[PDB]
Design a protein around this ligand. Structure first.
Ligand code: GTP
Ligand code: GTP
Ligand code: GDP
Ligand code: GDP
Ligand code: MG
Ligand code: MG
Lengths: 433, 428, 116, 432, 428
């Protein structure tokens, strides 16, 4: 009944969903081991075993044994069924070839088997939430091995995807443009929706709105935790118009290949600001389309706004939305698309945005996850492609990528298929006449 | 789990590694006997990387102590942390190699290499999933350059899938205390380009600069230098033992760090080095740590990076820090000095964070770089070699044990092939 | 000059240790953000019982309080304005006989929702 | 619903606001933090939940100091971070750095916070700006601000209240320079710009209220009561009311003579009022009293294009009309010939307030006397020649021309303010 | 966050700036090392301008001490407040200068130049807003003259939008303790005028002459002179450490003051300089501190205000006061004396008041004026120059060095152009 498996793969995705599974333990009464001292609601994320223990549905993978081990030597060891927490034996070493053709062709079986077990324990499987990277070896190569093998098995069932994309210039890897382009060669054809974020824009988002300077990767992950808790808000606690995983996969994706939406959170706020600001439905809706709150660090002013979906959480009076979402259309600075006049989707849950203790997101009574399929991401792809042309022209960082079981010709294939995505995203920039 | 077989070789190498096991045993909480007595439990969860398991709950090092000269191993076992090593790992012969590459490679050194392979193969095949063999060797002589590269070319064919960390003491420019010093290096770089994957090269001269001037020790003894090089050895394999945020190990710090196969001669550097008078005024925070990394006065190789460009740079940080400040500030030290970096690689950094700070330090970060400025160390040895070889000087020791002048010529030819390789991808 | 360069640094460093007075007290500014770094949620490295400062709560609260309570004088411009913010006598802000406030009536309550 | 986004650029604005917002709070009832221990507040305040009655003023200056004093005062809770906007290094009395350099790295932000505060409002009716006319912030920045406002708020009021570069007392040497360039800009925008030079107020404080210590605090308080009165009809209610728009098309004569002169009526002190009256007339007569005027310019040397009286208190409309008559039966008081009528007069019962500490004591009545005198030419002429004398020998000009403004700008302004004088006497010429 | 870097340059600064870093310390509330014994929150609210927060409070200053002779900073270090400075910004060369501008700007300058600009570069990078590089030299000597003008000329070539406030002792007639004193002004003023923004001038003579009327002290050491000159430079930059009701930073006290890009030699002064038998019989209000600020008896530069014409004057006040009382006092000065004010600038003042007052003083004020009578000083060193240049005086040290004579001809020429430009605007 309304269930989904969350495969948190890669060293990025395990710590992305590190605070997500903490956050689902705050919404439901799940304790740090799993007990309540309720109802149907704890079904999409946690299971139920016997006594009253709620085993989650997570397939935490890291091909190196360093970070998952702290999940299984930490203060939530009892919570996760220890089969779920799966490590490897040695890393992927920022190598698409290592994470996909050698180290990983070993962890593949056990990982796939775990999903068969977590799926045959469900009756309402509606989608696969996979959280990975695009730059690291596990988050580019091993998640590609999952995405391709998930298709011959379970199949056309939705495969929603959250990942931290290569930031424009502010980057913590070197060879990361090599891994990202090869990922898209094996993620365009399989991932139904591939909801995007990077690291950069969130630092700014908790630099001006939250005045918490010098943010770390745990602040940077809890905000993604509130993103996924409002996207999966309707496979849970009830309310007004409710959106399942299939909704986003017909209303946020124009054409087959063009399936890279952009996710923003509206109520990015601290304790002192929220005391001095009544976040009504009006301004919470406008703040989404402001071009510094996009979590991708692009200029949406440059691009079209093809497909858009606005989620809601809390005291959201229906009327307010229609009015608010209309103001957004009238404004000509919010530039739109005439090959789809409609453009917009609404969804309202009644569960208020939960607040994680030891956090900085103040308790707010309303929230928006503004999922936008804009084409301003083609500019981010264009800066990720010339970032690769001036390296492959003189064959830098190739010797690790080829000795490890990957044909040299895949660099050309990934290159020319990625330039197709640029042309496809420009064919959907031309006004129809 | 993921372990390292440590490989003290040569007269010098025993003394660096002795200080390596002085700093690691403090970081891992180990007694000078082996009985763990520490505060946290993080220093047991990956204790198996460097230290093995013995009965009585005592941790023995995975260290192979080899030197042709017996005057070092009695010394490392007559010091502070000496009664930890497994006593048959000491694999001494009894003959001085006379700083002769011929003696330590093609002659009497070969007697000891088959015995030291047996010690290594015992400690390498009795372990879960090895990554490689960190080496501290001594390119000024025969127990170093000789026993080193022969061992190194007799590990890369039995185990040809493993990291080959090769922390080297290359000949310092003006600092020189061996008269046949330039021969031993220039005959060894050939056998150190086609086997090793990460040759972090040090000179004594800059370590004399960072100790006497930067850190301001009054009387810099040689043992003070070995604590500095232990930092860049401990801090390069520290996400691999101690936990935290975004990690880095030897293969990570190779793939983003080796542009082309013969481009692995790196150059180290620590960061939170202070003095007595300037420990208490300098505010230890991420801003100050980034600058001393790139400053030429704190740099364990005889080269300002000014005459050249970094092909790639890594930084493996160590401490409780944020992560905006980690890479936004080094983006600042990537764009403010555009000529000092390559343009054919747009972003040039691997970062890392370990949560656990050093012993008595709030943060630290060892810095490794593949600068173009390695070529000057390799220019000067060649210049020193040409003045040597021009009239067949110091050669009757280097020819009476099996070595021909035809092999000498090859050594220089691949030697100045490397300075061309670090010049073809210079300014261009 | 290298043999001379060592001793000129030797002489300077010896005077540094003869005359150096160590730090003694941890002061901490209450009126500057010390920029705390967040904790990993699933971690026994970080989620332990480390005690907090009893005084730093008092120094932050004293930094908060009010200028009316911090200083028994009117130091700097801006503190004398709003210094005595009480009404002189009770205003009786409830009677229409002397006070002439507004109330928006039922349409004017609602009509703002049409334009908003 | 009849609201006014306040804006305070420069030390002058912020500080006078610190004395203007104390008034707003005390008057309505809000305690000094934003916690009401009525719907008037809905015009100068936004009740964000509980009782946090948040204000509405984008305080802006290119230096910390001033703004920080409020961000840590007995009113630090009465706002928001993005409303007390601060800046880096000052423009340093250089119209250039405030309109061509430093300021340009702060304008986009200030503009956005007004947009936000505009979206919230139901019906905007005046962006009351507060500049100082003579610095880089309260003149150069105010230029870029008012300018941009006339590209987004388009046809909307922007009534301003500045401190005129006073004749004698002048704590600045590039003081004349900024004024001319600024006036040039604040002419194709400002719907009406009241001015109150420090000199006159420093003087009216000497006798009326007998304060023998005029400071930059007591002065700003009286400037506050002016804005209070101007916007009391769009706050409380009584009899004939005057919305901001009416001020303009009932005072501003032609599309440029928008520079009134205001003078609070009962500026008496405390013990003196125990020996005085407040006759609805007496105050109106004493309003025209040559000295009581709060801008340096005896109106004798000119006429009264269009006065606009705003009253407050127990003012029986009967006595009001009697007063405006008994003052028209006086030759001295002289109006223009092209306009008979008289003055647009209004009454708001809500009696005046009493910020504790200020001299202005409780007075049953209060007649703010705004007036478009045709004599301001006097003051204007002075600055034109002050600028002239200096611009002649290119004095203190290198610093401006090396920070953006071209030499041409100084000239354009010189002739613009000269033309101004011509369109200030031509309108006085007895229509023939 | 608008910050100032201090730039010590020799005996006539080391001991003057020592008192500077003692006056600001005793007012911002610090102690020998760093411990804040202050008594108010406002006292600390702007320390970011002058000091830098070290590890755990205990601030450290933005000064760099620059001198060629070693023993001039040993007096600073051994002094009561000498521990404050960073022990690695005590940058010094080895050989003495011998009061030679050539030996301080050309020969042994360049060694202690790339080292000095490194500390200046690092201290400038750690800044939020940078609008000041306040320097304390003396023209008359050779180190301060030689280093100063040379150090001025390269900050302007590196950081050219900054207020260069350079306090300096000038060569002056009645006390003259250097004999090449005329040589070390004309070469100095030549470089000083065209690369600086603010150059508050003092001489020993008037500063001595202040002592033997005003304070009527029996015997001075230079220490009281340093206190009497460091009190000005605290008052000029009080709008940047303390708030008030009319604020004015350094760019405010130059662009609103200096008329043309040459006329930046201003004239300091302190108002309540009342003696030891007359403080009891004198009031404190702006009128009484108008006699003792506008008098030549509390003027400091060299000259008499009633020998030229004031071109632009300011007075940054400090204390709790009213202010018709500042402005009527200012207005009556300008109207009762309208013969010594340039008539082509109608209003001649810029007062600025900072409520936070001086310690131990109800109210204080700092007077600064651009009097034309600076001509009395600058012509006097030129006539002493012309008695030297004609007969080939103490010049072979200069010429034998490498200094050509033409650069000495450039010295009187630019000043004779300067002294003409300062009397031209007097006539107008
Ligand atoms: N926000 C956030 N980003 C992360 C986190 N962990 C990793 N990343 C991102 O991931 C990129 C590289 O880390 P990973 O992809 O996780 O490394 P990996 O997948 O293990 O690759 P290998 O170490 O070679 O196996 C960096 O650019 C980070 O921005 C995280 O915990 N939070
Ligand atoms: N009423 C009032 N007037 C002020 C205040 N501050 C300055 N003034 C007047 O405004 C004139 C010029 O303004 P400034 O003092 O330069 O302040 P500003 O307008 O913000 O200009 P900047 O200094 O560049 O920031 C001065 O001559 C003062 O007479 C104040 O706080 N209140
Ligand atoms: N690593 C290390 N270096 C040394 C030691 N003693 C000297 N050196 C340096 O190593 C160089 C000489 O190397 P050498 O000791 O002859 O190497 P060997 O061939 O193994 O004996 C000189 O430049 C010394 O500065 C030592 O104990 N440890
Ligand atoms: N006010 C003041 N003047 C000083 C001080 N020390 C030296 N002087 C003056 O400096 C002049 C001599 O300068 P000199 O020492 O040769 O300068 P140097 O070349 O930089 O060392 C004398 O006339 C002194 O009056 C001091 O601490 N305070
Ligand atoms: Mg990993
Ligand atoms: Mg100002």
């Amino acid at each position: 009944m309304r269930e989904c498996i969350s495969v948190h793969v890669g060293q990025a995705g395990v710590q992305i969903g590190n605070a997500c599974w903490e956050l689902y333990c705050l919404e439901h009464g799940i304790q740090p081991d799993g007990q309540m001292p309720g109802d149907d609601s704890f079904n999409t994320f946690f299971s139920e075993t016997g006594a009253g223990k709620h085993v989650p549905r997570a397939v935490f993978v890291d091909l190196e044994p360093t970070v998952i081990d702290e999940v299984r030597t930490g203060t939530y060891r009892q919570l996760f069924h220890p089969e779920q927490l799966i490590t490897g034996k040695e890393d992927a070493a920022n190598n698409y070839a290592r994470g996909h053709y050698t180290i990983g062709k070993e962890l593949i079986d056990l990982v796939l088997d775990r999903i068969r077990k977590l799926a045959d324990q469900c009756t309402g499987l509606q989608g696969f939430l996979i959280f990975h990277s695009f730059g690291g070896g596990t988050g580019s190569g091993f998640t590609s091995l999952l995405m391709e093998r998930l298709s011959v098995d379970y199949g056309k069932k939705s495969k929603l995807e959250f990942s931290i994309y290569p930031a424009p210039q502010v980057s913590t890897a070197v060879v990361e443009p090599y891994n990202s382009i090869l990922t898209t060669h094996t993620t365009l054809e399989h991932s139904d929706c591939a909801f995007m974020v990077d690291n950069e824009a969130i630092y700014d988002i908790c630099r001006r709105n939250l005045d918490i300077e010098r943010p770390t990767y745990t602040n940077l992950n809890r905000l993604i935790g509130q993103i996924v808790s409002s996207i999966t808000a309707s496979l849970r606690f009830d309310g007004a118009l409710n959106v399942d995983l299939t909704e986003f996969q017909t209303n946020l994706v124009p054409y087959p290949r063009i399936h890279f939406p952009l996710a923003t959170y509206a109520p990015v706020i601290s304790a002192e600001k929220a005391y001095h600001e009544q976040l009504s439905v009006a301004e919470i809706t406008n703040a989404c389309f402001e071009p510094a709150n996009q979590m991708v660090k692009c200029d949406p002013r440059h691009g079209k706004y093809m497909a858009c979906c606005l989620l809601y959480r809390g005291d959201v009076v229906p009327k307010d939305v229609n009015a608010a979402i209309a103001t957004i259309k009238t404004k000509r600075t919010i530039q739109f698309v005439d090959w789809c006049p409609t453009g917009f989707k609404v969804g309202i849950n009644y569960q208020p945005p939960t607040v994680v203790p030891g956090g900085d997101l103040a308790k707010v009574q309303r929230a928006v996850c503004m999922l936008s399929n804009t084409t301003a991401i083609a500019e981010a792809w264009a800066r990720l492609d010339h970032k690769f042309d001036l390296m492959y022209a003189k064959r830098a960082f190739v010797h690790w990528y080829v000795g490890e079981g990957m044909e040299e010709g895949e660099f050309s294939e990934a290159r020319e298929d990625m330039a197709a995505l640029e042309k496809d995203y420009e064919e959907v920039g031309m006004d129809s006449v | 789990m993921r372990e390292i077989v440590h490989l003290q070789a040569g007269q010098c190498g025993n003394q660096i590694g002795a200080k390596f096991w002085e700093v690691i045993s403090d970081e891992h909480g180990i007694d000078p006997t082996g009985t763990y007595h520490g505060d946290s439990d993080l220093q047991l969860e990956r204790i198996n990387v460097y230290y093995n398991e013995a009965t009585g709950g005592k941790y023995v090092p995975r260290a192979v102590l080899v030197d042709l000269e017996p005057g070092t191993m009695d010394s490392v076992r007559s010091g502070p942390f000496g009664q930890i090593f497994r006593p048959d790992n000491f694999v001494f012969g009894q003959s001085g190699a006379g700083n002769n590459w011929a003696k330590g490679h093609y002659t009497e050194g070969a007697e000891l290499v088959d015995s030291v392979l047996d010690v290594v193969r015992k400690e390498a095949e009795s372990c879960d999933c090895l990554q490689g063999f960190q080496l501290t060797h001594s390119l000024g002589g025969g127990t170093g350059s000789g026993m080193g590269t022969l061992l190194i070319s007799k590990i890369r064919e039995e185990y040809p899938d493993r990291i080959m960390n090769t922390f080297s003491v290359v000949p310092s420019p003006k600092v020189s205390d061996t008269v046949v010093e330039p021969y031993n290096a220039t005959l060894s770089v050939h056998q150190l380009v086609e086997n090793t994957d990460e040759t972090y090269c040090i000179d004594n001269e800059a370590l004399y600069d960072i100790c006497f001037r930067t850190l301001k020790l009054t009387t810099p003894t040689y043992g003070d230098l070995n604590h500095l090089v232990s930092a860049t050895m401990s801090g390069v394999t520290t996400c691999l033992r101690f936990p935290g945020q975004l990690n880095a190990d030897l293969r990570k710090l190779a793939v983003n760090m080796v542009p082309f196969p013969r481009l692995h001669f790196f150059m180290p550097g620590f960061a939170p080095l202070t003095s007595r008078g300037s420990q208490q005024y300098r505010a230890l925070t991420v801003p100050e740590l980034t600058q001393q990394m790139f400053d030429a006065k704190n740099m364990m190789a005889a080269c300002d990076p000014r005459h050249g460009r970094y092909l790639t740079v890594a930084a493996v940080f160590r401490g409780r820090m944020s992560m905006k400040e980690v890479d936004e500030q080094m983006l600042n030290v990537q764009n403010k000095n555009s000529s000092y970096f390559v343009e054919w690689i747009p972003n040039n950094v691997k970062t890392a964070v370990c949560d656990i700070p050093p012993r008595g330090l709030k943060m630290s970060a060892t810095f490794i770089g593949n600068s173009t400025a390695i070529q000057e160390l390799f220019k000067r040895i060649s210049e020193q070699f040409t003045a040597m070889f021009r009239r067949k000087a110091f050669l009757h020791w280097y020819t009476g044990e099996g070595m021909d002048e035809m092999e000498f010529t090859e050594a220089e030819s691949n030697m100045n092939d490397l300075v061309s390789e670090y010049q073809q991808y210079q300014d261009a | 000059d290298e043999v001379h360069q060592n001793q000129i640094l030797r002489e300077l460093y010896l005077k540094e240790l003869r005359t150096q007075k160590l730090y003694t007290q941890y002061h901490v500014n209450p009126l500057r953000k010390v920029h705390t770094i967040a904790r990993k949620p699933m971690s026994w490295h970080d989620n332990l019982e480390e005690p907090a400062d009893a005084r730093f709560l008092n120094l932050i609260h004293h930094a908060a309080q009010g200028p009316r309570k911090k200083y028994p004088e009117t130091q700097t411009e801006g503190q004398e304005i709003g210094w005595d913010s009480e009404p002189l006598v009770n205003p009786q802000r409830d009677d229409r006989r002397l006070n002439h406030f507004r109330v928006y009536k039922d349409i004017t309550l609602y009509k703002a929702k049409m334009w908003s």
